[PDB]
């Protein structure tokens, strides 16, 4: 069945959505650990805005803490609590 | 509260997830239309695999058709049915 225009619009508009983010992206300076799992499920801003002069950004943010296996190759591993930014509310704002 | 290691692992493992894909990405050769909405909600493969030699890819695929506003700037606009690839099943496969 065809998805209807107003549905496509409504489901795709700038909102917080479960997004799988690579941990190396959130901690770009880790030159020592490999992570397992290598990505985490975070609420983040996704979708699109009416104008192309607008962009989809977070208004309200919060932290979530997850247990990740941290491996230093040939040197050891442990489970460590790591913190990630989540987006609770998004809005379309000027660039 | 802390998300537990086996939960993080289970929620992040290679599976089909609702993903907001830019339409210009799925139709990279459209040098004529602007699209509204500019992105669509598609099931696609996301997450991560146990090895870094593995990657997360689709096994089973299907098509979905959505009504999108297609604008040719200064020249007109209409609603058009566009087709997008969805992923019904994903698995971790060697690179």
């Amino acid at each position, epitope marked *: 069945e065809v998805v209807k225009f107003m549905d496509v619009y409504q489901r795709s508009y700038c909102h917080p959505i479960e997004t799988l983010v690579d941990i190396f992206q959130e901690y770009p300076d880790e030159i020592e650990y490999i992570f397992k799992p290598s990505c985490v499920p975070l609420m983040r801003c996704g979708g699109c805005c009416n104008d192309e002069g607008l962009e989809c950004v977070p208004t309200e943010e919060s932290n979530i803490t997850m247990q990740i296996m941290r491996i230093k190759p040939h040197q050891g*591993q442990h489970i460590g609590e790591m913190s990630f930014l989540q987006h609770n509310k998004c809005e379309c704002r000027p660039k | 509260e802390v998300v537990k290691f086996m939960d993080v692992y289970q929620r992040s493992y290679c599976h089909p997830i609702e993903t907001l894909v830019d339409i210009f990405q799925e139709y990279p050769d459209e040098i004529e239309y602007i699209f509204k909405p500019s992105c669509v909600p598609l099931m696609r493969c996301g997450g991560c695999c146990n090895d870094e030699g593995l990657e997360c890819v689709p096994t089973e695929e299907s098509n979905i058709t959505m009504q999108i506003m297609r604008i040719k700037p200064h020249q007109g606009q209409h609603i058009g049915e566009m087709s997008f690839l969805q992923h019904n099943k994903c698995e971790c496969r060697p690179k």
Partner: antibody
Amino acid sequence: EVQLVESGGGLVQPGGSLRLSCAASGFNIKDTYIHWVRQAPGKGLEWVARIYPTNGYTRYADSVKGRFTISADTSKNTAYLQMNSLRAEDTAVYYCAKLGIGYYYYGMDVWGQGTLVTVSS
Amino acid sequence: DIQMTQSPSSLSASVGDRVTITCRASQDIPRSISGYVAWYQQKPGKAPKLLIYWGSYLYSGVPSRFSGSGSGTDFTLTISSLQPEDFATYYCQQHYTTPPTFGQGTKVEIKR
């Protein structure tokens, strides 16, 4: 099944040499660390050496560093511990043990049966 | 590189009792870190068997009266309902910083 079988122990004179073998079945040691652990009579477990077979990286306990050499032949699926300059304190049961990598690194779940090395004249 | 100090050195307990064995890391490690200790059971003259891995996970085919927990520097192995077959020496192992070192062992005697 997954298995390790040691051989090559026995009696050896002080100052002498001995080579221990460890044959892996059911898995490829290329995906693995292979370790030697020893137990002197009535004493605790003592980690002694480790090899990463693919790249041939080795680590050793201070008590044996310079005298012992660990290696692995990936094509025979076998690991070795060359022991030189033996002393009374090296008398022990010597175990081979496997650790996996990444999510497969959780502990020594596969051991050999142990081989007694006795250093005496 | 860390050493583990394991305690007690020996203990004696009755069938059905709760046995608690402890492993402490030599360096200061925050409570946010966990999952770096394995526990083994060694019957006399045999190879050790893995009981618990990553601090708290029960290895396959090991009776569920064995459990483990810990964080920071402090790890615990618990046998919730001691059985006669549980006579053994128990060892911890750290892999926070490898090469992975063992504790000195806890000899468990069954009091009958």
